[PDB]
Design a protein around this ligand. Sequence first.
Ligand SMILES: COc1ccccc1[C@H]1OCCCN(C(=O)N2CCC(CC(=O)O)CC2)CC(=O)N(CC(C)(C)C)c2ccc(Cl)cc21
Length: 335
Amino acid sequence: LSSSLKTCYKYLNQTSRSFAAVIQALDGEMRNAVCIFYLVLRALDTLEDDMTISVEKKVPLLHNFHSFLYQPDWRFMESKEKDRQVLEDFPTISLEFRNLAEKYQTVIADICRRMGIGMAEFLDKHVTSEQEWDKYCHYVAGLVGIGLSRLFSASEFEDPLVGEDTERANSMGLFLQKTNIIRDYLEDQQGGREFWPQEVWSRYVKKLGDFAKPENIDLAVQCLNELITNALHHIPDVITYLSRLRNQSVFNFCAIPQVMAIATLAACYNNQQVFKGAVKIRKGQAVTLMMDATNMPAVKAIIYQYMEEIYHRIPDSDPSSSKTRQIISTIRTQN
Ligand SMILES: COc1ccccc1[C@H]1OCCCN(C(=O)N2CCC(CC(=O)O)CC2)CC(=O)N(CC(C)(C)C)c2ccc(Cl)cc21
């Protein structure tokens, strides 16, 4: 390995932690192509996230990010974010980008271009409708699922349908993203960020921050349950997506985050703690899920068990209760 690729893998371990090993297990050319795509997305995200960067400066950065991949000397030195290293040493990452086969370069660059356009569109605004929530999620997460899918097909380890079915790929990203947004309500609040859609929360309270106040906890949990019900709608696509994967290392790569999100939604369902702190999967729980998620029958079993759990916990007066029951029944009767 070149020294620049070794630095890339060190950044991957710093950023993706226990998940780095799963990326490192990808077969053949998929390994480096995913590692670089991961780091490049980490850099894009770090620009997006950084509230110290003015909108005037951020819009060009987001729009032009795809171009920076091709600019050997391009770097960014003024990020105050946690993963600022991937921006300060972007030349190391971009060099390795430009060492990839062109069929992978072109995927990554197109995705970065489209994601940057969409991230720049949401700088001013908060998410209003459920449709806008899916648009925002497409830009920051659905397009990641689409890009990855295209690397798998372009590498020929998976059938072309995997790369072409953008809707199923998009759902893979939306499932994770909505789960993260649902779970991270409070830390986002404290960070001054709002991602829960205004059209759902405004039916319960006057301001999104009101869910942190004790007197509104019942209303908060109802909205939580409603948003969780929303996220569960992606699971049929997730099952379809995963069912098509023929390469073991790709399967594990794609399946592990999905079953972690399933378990996360089940922990968060009807859970007041979402509003008081960070609800997390026990490490031992996470490890077993990661070890088990290696074939369709096992992943389906895991989905069904957690959905049955949610199902038995649905409160009769929950405002979404029949919607929750219906999507769980749909999921259960597919495979
Ligand atoms: C669409 O997403 C897919 C699709 C297929 C496969 C993988 C992903 C996804 O990875 C999920 C697991 C790793 N993620 C992560 O950062 N960690 C942090 C450390 C944690 C473990 C730990 O702390 O030890 C695990 C979770 C990255 C991530 O969440 N996303 C998903 C979105 C874009 C919603 C944020 C991500 C980003 C880039 C790529 Cl290339 C993949 C992904």
